[PDB]
């Protein structure tokens, strides 16, 4: 499973996976920690600029995140890791197979709740110790005492007391003594959320049927009851800016704001997060500001701010509505296609099944943006199936071409303007677009039709110029050499077309044993590889028009493949969940990998130091480093049998 040529370092394009995010303050800078699968990411509340990431991925997905000054507590499977600045310092391992569910850290105590209604208590070995490490005791709540644990919460001014909230009701446990001290009265409705109010002895509780219950635990009685018919509460948070305000998250993606003093609704934000992805998974007011942060399972983190009242008097009466200020998002579904934006390798384009096109920055800035779909005049478009980019003529006219699913025409995209272009290209043969390519000069665009026709347009003027009709089945690949002289095409019918683009004639035709699925053309070396239906990769040189290298070993269809920027290596991915690196000079596989998720796309960076891959699952992009770029690598042929045994 370990590659001798590649090694993972970070995923690009993911801000949150849906786990509730925690917040904390480092001096005057406030930070937000968000879960990203098996890793996490810390952002600065002032500018949301990435600060730190996990040094290594956890073996199991993180279930609960808690932040406390320099230390952030992450729980996954049955063991809780203490992280500082993204580094591992000390790992907590529970003594039971039951996975952890919830976390609470107050004072020198760390409380961990497992699925089996068992709470584990830890104490700092030393009073001045930075984090709790020693195991104090174990407290388990039985069904008779209460239901399953909803969360672990600690109210202010409580010495060594954990306010455990369960499905049935709330329970108080003195962790120092490990005794049940108080049991709350049973509630008719299912409890789902609990949040400590700033005020003493009152904790807000959210049910599944749109009920917010402000249970005063000192007096042990209900104080207030806000009713939200036909809804379930997902998150709660109160405004600490001196103004009495309450925030309600709901699965429907609506964020409601109540003013408890006046017993009224201030304003409602609709659909801030998608309902299907859990709506508002978490929303928190930042301590002492009009700032409220919001997140969801849609891979987006948003913030809203409350401006000062516009009325010189009765400012409480005139409350400005919450305003969008800043955010990030990413793909809400796994990307379908990827390509490297520029030679410098600072930006990458990404398309997903969510019908959205994004540009992801590679540097620490982590800037991410949507491609604007607003049409020019002289819902989202269907997902892309093929895309090509070129950079010679950026800023003068359109430099990207795309083919949409079940769509007869291709759309253009302008990288500099980051907006749709003013040109649309039709196949003109009642066929769907199956291949898109562009010349190096950036003047010509090539479209492959499902009926076997190749139409050649001009990028700047968007006017049909040349049409070649040789293939009788769908054209699955088009490519033109840097000299703009000889163009290469392949189709599902099993033939490879060779043309003189300048003179518009046949240089030759080559028929292969199996149908061709895809093409990649290396202009510098004048070599192009073909993914054949027989689970083979065929390399062909355009100059001599003969088969050059044939590769065998893949156990299933080849999802994607590419040339190295040097033209010496090809790395391919197949449905058998393997990534194989092939050395063209010797025509043998030098390294093999096994990916848990089938890699849908594979792309080298222009420099060759980096390798980007996309998988069937995950809203991010898995980016790899090329180790040969730092040292020499042997080309000895990998053992097939051992690789098969590993799989």
């Amino acid at each position: 499973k370990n590659s001798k040529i590649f090694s993972p370092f970070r995923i690009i394009g993911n801000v949150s996976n849906g786990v509730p995010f925690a917040t904390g303050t480092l001096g005057s800078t406030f930070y937000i920690v968000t879960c990203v699968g098996k890793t996490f990411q810390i952002y600065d509340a002032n500018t949301l600029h990435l600060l730190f990431v996990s040094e290594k991925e956890t073996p199991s997905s993180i279930v609960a995140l808690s932040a406390h000054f320099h230390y952030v507590y992450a729980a996954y499977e049955n063991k809780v890791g203490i992280y500082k600045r993204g580094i591992e310092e000390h790992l907590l391992e529970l003594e039971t197979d039951a996975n952890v569910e919830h976390l609470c850290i107050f004072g020198d105590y760390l409380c961990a709740s497992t699925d089996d209604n068992s709470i584990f208590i830890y104490k700092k070995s030393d009073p001045q110790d930075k984090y709790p490490s020693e195991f104090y005791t174990k407290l388990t709540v039985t069904e008779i005492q209460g239901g399953e644990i909803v969360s672990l919460q600690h109210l202010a001014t409580y010495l060594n007391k954990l306010t455990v909230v369960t499905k049935s009701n709330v329970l108080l446990f003195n962790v120092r003594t490990g005794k049940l001290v108080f049991t709350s009265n049973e509630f008719p409705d299912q409890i789902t959320t609990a949040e400590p109010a700033p005020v003493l002895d009152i904790i807000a509780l959210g049910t599944v049927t749109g009920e917010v219950i402000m249970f005063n635990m000192r007096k042990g009685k209900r104080i207030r009851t806000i009713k939200i018919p036909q809804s379930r509460i997902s998150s709660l948070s109160f405004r600490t800016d001196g103004s009495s305000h309450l925030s309600v998250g709901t699965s429907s993606g609506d964020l409601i704001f109540y003013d408890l003093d006046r017993r009224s609704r201030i304003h409602v934000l609709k659909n801030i997060h998608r309902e299907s992805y859990g709506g508002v998974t978490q929303a928190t007011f930042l301590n002492g500001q009009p700032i409220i942060v919001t997140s969801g399972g849609d891979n987006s983190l948003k913030e809203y701010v409350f401006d000062p009242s516009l009325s010189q008097g009765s400012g409480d009466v005139v409350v400005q509505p919450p305003r969008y200020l800043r955010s990030r998002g990413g793909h809400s579904q796994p990307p379908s296609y990827i390509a490297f934006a520029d030679s410098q390798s600072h930006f990458m384009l990404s398309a997903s099944k969510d019908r959205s096109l994004w540009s992801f920055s590679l540097r620490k800035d982590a800037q991410s943006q949507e491609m604007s779909q607003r049409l020019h005049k002289k819902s989202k478009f269907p997902e892309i199936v093929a895309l090509a980019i070129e950079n010679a003529r950026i800023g003068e006219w359109e430099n990207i071409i795309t083919a949409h699913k079940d769509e007869k025409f291709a759309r253009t995209w302008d990288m500099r303007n980051k907006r749709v272009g003013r040109w649309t290209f039709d196949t003109t043969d009642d066929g769907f677009v199956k291949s898109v390519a562009m010349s190096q000069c950036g003047n010509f665009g090539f479209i492959g039709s499902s009926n076997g026709s190749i139409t050649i347009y001009n990028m700047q003027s968007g006017i049909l110029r040349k049409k070649y009709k040789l293939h009788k089945r769908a054209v699955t690949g088009i490519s033109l050499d840097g000299m703009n002289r000889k163009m290469v095409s392949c189709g599902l019918d099993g033939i490879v077309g060779f043309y003189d683009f300048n003179k518009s004639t046949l240089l030759g035709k080559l028929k292969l044993d199996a149908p061709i699925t895809a093409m990649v053309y290396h202009r510098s070396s004048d070599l192009f590889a073909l993914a054949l239906d027989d689970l083979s990769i065929v390399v062909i040189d355009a100059v001599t028009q003969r088969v050059v290298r044939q590769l065998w070993g893949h156990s299933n269809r080849i999802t994607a493949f590419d040339f190295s920027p040097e033209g010496r290596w090809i790395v391919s991915a197949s449905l058998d969940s393997t990534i194989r690196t092939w050395d063209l000079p010797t025509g043998g596989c030098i390294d093999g990998i096994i990916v848990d998720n089938v890699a849908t796309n594979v792309k080298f960076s222009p420099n060759g130091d980096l390798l980007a891959t996309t998988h069937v699952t995950g809203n991010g992009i898995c980016i790899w480093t090329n180790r040969a770029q730092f040292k020499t690598v042997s080309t000895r042929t990998i053992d097939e049998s051992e690789f098969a045994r590993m799989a």
């Binding site: 930042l286 500001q289 700032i291 701010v305 401006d307 000062p308 516009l310 400005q320 305003r323 200020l325």
Partner: peptide, 13 residues
């Protein structure tokens, strides 16, 4: 003239 509602820059405290 209609009520000017400027999106005044907000810096955190």
């Amino acid at each position: 003239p209609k009520v000017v509602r400027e999106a005044k820059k907000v810096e955190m405290t």
